[PDB]
């Protein structure tokens, strides 16, 4: 079947199985450490294994957080984060999402980011446009008297310059999903020059943001490029306009 | 009918109606100017009117965000924000909350804070302890290597030093519900020294937070005392521990 039908499949199965853990630290506990020297909790495992209970059957290349890279030679590669923003999850902050990115020869083909709590499918086939539960969605027109943003800054930033230059701040702690908010028009931009994000966090939303009219760029301003691997953090900037990108490039 | 029942009952009813406007920024218009001077959107009005219908036949005083003060000269005072987090709400950001606090003799008696999309009832009867959906909650144990905070700084705070002390940041744009985030033990603290919150924003969660064992102070670190008006904003520091408070006072 088609990719959106497979992504949404896995999405909704992870959903039923991991939502009762939502906010219930009493029930979760560490179960391993990820190759990235990170702690894996029981709900991450459960959610990754489900996804893998499906994806292995497709004989493609799966690429995930707590598991690194499984090469099968395919022209196809699934980049997944079964749960983006697990801290929030385990702690009852309602901002997490399933991230599933389909690549055909390392070029974007299909992207899906599912926001469990609000039952929202954000998807885009490469070249086909960006949708939110069947409706097109677009980066919002720039208004410098109405900048709303979310950022992940380094020591290298003048935060007050920033705070001065924008109007609102939101900082949700799930990069993948924040990218989708740039895509749907809520945010003027999100970024992380404090290099922590990785391909498993931005792949699926990459595609979606691009088709949304977004300007995805690196530290410097040229189009962002990335390798598919569970390792490698990367600076990223996801603004809705040349102007917006400026202001942000204007501080780092 | 018990105070907590009135509160819960108005919650579920506002829910019915306003949820359809969630993120549907294409479905709402501005009917006027809350006495102060901000946009009163249609859903603001609707949710308020549903509250006042139940309250009117009670003959208690009412402090409301979009209507200020109604004095029926009763010893009972009900302070409400039908929706805390408008912006998020109509921009489809799932962080907003119904606020309902009951005071007797201008002393805390009961607080409800309803997190709609989570269907989380936060509440405390004054002196009886704070609950979340029936489970007793209590602030987070202090750990200096694991500070998680939310803040709204004045144009004076050392954001640099500030960020250098804490381990995670989140800023959600809903003081009322953010307050219960300390109450329930997710954040070490939230504060607003950019004098913006009003009574309507913190009454219900003031109570809940106190019963959760939080410290609630003003800039000087002196015990917060506030008057029940829908006017004049206040500096507030809700924290989980003295140490947390101090760190926040140092950069104040
Ligand atoms: O780890 P996770 O909770 O699955 O996802 C986290 C989010 O993408 C967050 O935005 C980023 O700053 C962290 O580095 C990630 O770890
Ligand atoms: O307007 P509203 O969304 O009902 O309430 C807002 C929230 O309490 C927010 O935390 C505060 O920073 C704003 O100043 C308030 O106006
Ligand atoms: Ca994850
Ligand atoms: Ca992640
Ligand atoms: Ca309000
Ligand atoms: Ca408010």
UniProtKB/Swiss-Prot annotation, chains A, B:
GO biological process terms, semicolon-separated: inositol metabolic process; phosphatidylinositol phosphate biosynthetic process; signal transduction
GO molecular function, one term: inositol monophosphate 1-phosphatase activity
Residues reported in the UniProt entry to bind Mg(2+) 2: 81, 84, 201
InterPro entries, alphabetized: Inositol_monoP_metal-BS, Inositol_monophosphatase-like, Inositol_monophosphatase_CS
Gene3D superfamilies: 3.40.190.80, Fructose-1,6-Bisphosphatase, subunit A, domain 1
Binding sites annotated in the UniProt record for substrate: 84-86, 170, 175, 194
Origin: domain of life: Archaea
Cofactors, names only: Mg(2+)
Reaction(s) this enzyme catalyzes, per UniProt: beta-D-fructose 1,6-bisphosphate + H2O = beta-D-fructose 6-phosphate + phosphate; a myo-inositol phosphate + H2O = myo-inositol + phosphate
Activity-regulation annotation: IMPase activity is inhibited by Ca(2+) and Zn(2+). In contrast to mammalian I-1-P phosphatases, is not inhibited by Li(+) up to 100 mM.
Spans traversing the lipid bilayer: none
Keywords: Carbohydrate metabolism, Hydrolase, Magnesium, Metal-binding
Temperature dependence per UniProt: Is thermostable. After incubation at 85 degrees Celsius for 30 minutes, more than 95% of I-1-Pase activity remains.
Disulfide bonds: none
Positions of Mg(2+) 1 binding: 65, 81, 83
Pfam families noted in UniProt: Inositol_P
EC number: 3.1.3.11, 3.1.3.25
Function: Phosphatase with broad specificity; it can dephosphorylate fructose 1,6-bisphosphate, both D and L isomers of inositol-1-phosphate (I-1-P), 2'-AMP, pNPP, beta-glycerol phosphate, and alpha-D-glucose-1-phosphate. Cannot hydrolyze glucose-6-phosphate, fructose-6-phosphate, NAD(+) or 5'-AMP. May be involved in the biosynthesis of a unique osmolyte, di-myo-inositol 1,1-phosphate.
Subunit comment: Homodimer.
Family label: Belongs to the inositol monophosphatase superfamily. FBPase class 4 family.
Protein name: Fructose-1,6-bisphosphatase/inositol-1-monophosphatase
Gene (name only): suhB
């Amino acid at each position: 079947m088609k990719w959106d039908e497979i992504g949404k499949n896995i999405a909704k199965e992870i959903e039923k199985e991991i939502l009762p853990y939502f906010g219930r630290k009493d029930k979760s506990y560490v179960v391993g450490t990820s190759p990235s020297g990170d702690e894996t909790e029981i709900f991450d495992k459960i959610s990754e294994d489900i996804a893998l209970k499906y994806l292995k059957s497709l004989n493609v290349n799966i690429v995930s957080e707590e598991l690194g890279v499984i090469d099968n030679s395919s022209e196809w590669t699934v980049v997944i984060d079964p749960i983006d923003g697990s801290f929030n999850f385990i702690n009852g902050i309602p901002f997490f999402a399933f991230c599933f990115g389909v690549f055909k020869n390392n070029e974007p083909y299909y992207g899906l980011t599912y926001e469990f709590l609000t039952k929202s499918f954000y998807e885009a086939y490469k070249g086909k446009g960006a949708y939110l539960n069947g409706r097109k969605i677009k980066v919002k027109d720039f208004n410098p008297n109405n900048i709303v943003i979310s950022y992940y800054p380094s020591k290298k930033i003048d935060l007050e310059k920033l705070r001065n230059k924008v109007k609102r701040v939101r900082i949700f702690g799930a990069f993948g999903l924040e990218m989708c908010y740039v895509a749907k028009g809520t945010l003027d931009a999100v970024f992380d020059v404090r290099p922590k994000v990785r391909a498993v966090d931005i792949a699926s939303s990459y595609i979606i943001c691009k088709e949304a009219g977004a300007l995805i760029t690196d530290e410097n301003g040229d189009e962002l490029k990335f390798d598919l691997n569970a390792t490698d953090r990367l600076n990223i900037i996801v603004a809705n306009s040349k102007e917006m990108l400026d202001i942000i490039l204007d501080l780092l």
